[PDB]
Symmetry: C2
């Protein structure tokens, strides 16, 4: 079980279907259209993971036939926010599919995220955030990598998506091919809006250096580092 | 003589002052504030080059005391456009200084540009364009890398400026440290506005691959590649 939901009211139902593929019946979206899911563990293996954002039954790419997600109450999520609330880092070694209505997804894990041969299907924008979401009375305000020196790692087998990609972390170490419509990498200790506008920054006590090996197959690449003194190594 | 002015009406007066440092009395700016200088050769050696954009005499960093540039007719250039009109590629191995009023500079050379330990002083924005400027009845309309497969090379000794940096070429091969306030790299076969907005693009017949080794010391990096199929290698 790569993905283990939190026991609380934001923990989605997670099941394994033959092959080891995980199916996540994401929790009911709030009024902002955000399905806020909380996890003790979030890891995707080679068999992949399917997030059920479907209003009607159909064929998924990774898990075959699935019924609709009745949690949706007739309205699909605009954003699937996957928040790790434990101390466990995340490893993504396979494809994450949004089944049903295309949506944005965010994985937040302040303990670290590693993507090695991972990818995203039917996801308009995928963000990996080594940090925490920011909430104000239940409403999503943005994200934080403050007080954090952990790593977003991208392995030799790379990352693929046909949609937009955001890479947000105190530091990034990438060793493979990143394929995306657009790539946005924001490094350092920062607070962000919901749209990853940088709102504030800390200077780390020690250097937070990022490294990009390999390649980027994308028509538009942006790298923003706010750690004064720290560099981007290629 | 690294820098050799064109014989025509856009050729500036170029002199060498002791040490081998070149001093360029740039031509009178037009009504858009552009000093359009044309060259048979444009190369900067270790002693550097000083572009005289001064309304009053003073001390230059690279060439010591200089008098004002009387060509200016009381108004300094906003943009110093340095256009190579021959077949000769450019090598920049030293610092280019704007003496006097800070200005933007552009070097256009469709035959190729190599920067190895080069830099820019008192230059708010420096652009290196492996392509040609576009004119309409004397007015600068933008730039073109169409029908061009030549290289912008950045060597192991890198490039430094305290200002903005644009790198525009069919392909880029960088092997050193690029230090700038912001770095913008636009690759492929493109037409550009004066502000390097991409207006149109060609698909090259063969791959135009760019390579970035080394590092980038800059808070904001953008890489835009329009060559569909071609990649950015790190």
């Amino acid at each position: 079980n790569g993905i283990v939901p939190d026991a609380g009211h934001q923990g989605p139902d997670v099941s394994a279907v033959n092959g080891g593929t995980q199916v996540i019946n994401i929790v009911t979206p709030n009024n902002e259209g955000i399905s806020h899911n909380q996890y003790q563990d979030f890891n995707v293996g080679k068999p992949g993971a399917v997030f059920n954002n479907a209003l009607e039954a159909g064929q998924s790419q990774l898990a075959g036939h699935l019924n609709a997600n009745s949690n949706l109450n007739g309205q699909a999520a605009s954003l699937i926010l996957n928040e790790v609330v434990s101390r466990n880092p995340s490893f993504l070694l396979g494809q994450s599919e949004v089944f049903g209505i295309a949506a944005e997804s965010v994985l937040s894990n302040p303990n670290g995220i590693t993507c090695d041969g991972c990818g995203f299907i039917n996801t308009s924008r995928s963000s990996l955030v080594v940090g925490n979401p920011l909430f104000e009375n239940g409403q999503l305000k943005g994200y934080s990598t403050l007080n954090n020196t952990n790593l977003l790692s991208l392995g030799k087998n790379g990352l693929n998506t046909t949609g937009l990609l955001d890479l947000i972390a105190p530091r990034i170490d990438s060793r493979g091919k990143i394929t995306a419509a657009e790539i946005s990498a924001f490094t350092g200790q920062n607070t962000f809006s919901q749209h990853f506008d940088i709102l504030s920054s800390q200077k780390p006590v020690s250097a937070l250096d990022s490294y990009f090996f390999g390649s980027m197959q994308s028509g538009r690449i942006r790298i923003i580092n706010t750690a004064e003194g720290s560099g981007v190594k290629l």
